[PDB]
Design a protein around this ligand. Structure first.
Ligand code: HEM
Ligand code: NO2
Ligand code: NO2
Ligand code: NO2
Ligand code: NO2
Length: 153
């Protein structure tokens, strides 16, 4: 369980994400696909993309990135009271997309990498620790949901 002070550090850096959600979404997905290329294979709509430049030029990739970061933002703004948000997300990611927990760990690492690079003023060690805690809580709750839903994860 996060303290209020930890949630404020999470939401302070998220506020900067929200200055340019589309840009942050491109950076984060690209980081994920570069660091863990296997994850790209889950995205039927752009698994053909071969280079970062092609990734950056993809309007569809940008849209997906906005969608992810917006749904995650909505979760973070719940400050752990996110059961309603997590239900449809867990269902689609378990059953339709088949996203293992390992892959959610990879995107968490990509989020942390991008925030560290872009937002050093709001992402010093304490802030990064808070974000990691919030993302770990997210993954823990999604994992519990996956198990309820019948998906190994
Ligand atoms: C912070 C973690 C994540 C969040 C909040 C998130 C959220 C979303 C949302 C809201 C959608 C659209 C509605 C839906 O289908 O549920 C979506 C679509 C999808 N997500 Fe995620 N997602 C996350 C992580 C991942 C990861 C790590 C992968 C793959 C490695 C993945 C694969 C997909 C795929 C394949 C789609 C369909 C994309 C398309 O429209 O072409 N997601 N995600
Ligand atoms: O300003 N929110 O994307
Ligand atoms: O589009 N889900 O990362
Ligand atoms: O459960 N939604 O694909
Ligand atoms: O993308 N992780 O450093």
């Amino acid at each position: 369980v996060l303290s209020e002070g930890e949630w404020q550090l999470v939401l302070h850096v998220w506020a900067k994400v929200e200055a340019d959600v589309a840009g942050h979404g491109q950076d984060i997905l690209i980081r994920l696909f570069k660091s863990h290329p296997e994850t790209l294979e889950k995205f039927d709509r752009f698994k053909h993309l071969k280079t970062e430049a092609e990734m950056k030029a993809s309007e569809d990739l940008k849209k997906v990135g906005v969608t992810v970061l917006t749904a995650l933002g909505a979760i973070l703004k719940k400050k752990g009271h996110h059961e309603a948000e997590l239900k449809p997300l867990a269902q689609s990611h378990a059953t339709k997309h088949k996203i293992p927990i390992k892959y959610l760990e990879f995107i968490s690492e990509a989020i942390i990498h991008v925030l560290h690079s872009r937002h050093p003023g709001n992402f010093g060690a304490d802030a990064q620790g808070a974000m990691n805690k919030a993302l770990e809580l997210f993954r823990k709750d999604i994992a519990a949901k996956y198990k309820e839903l019948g998906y190994q994860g």
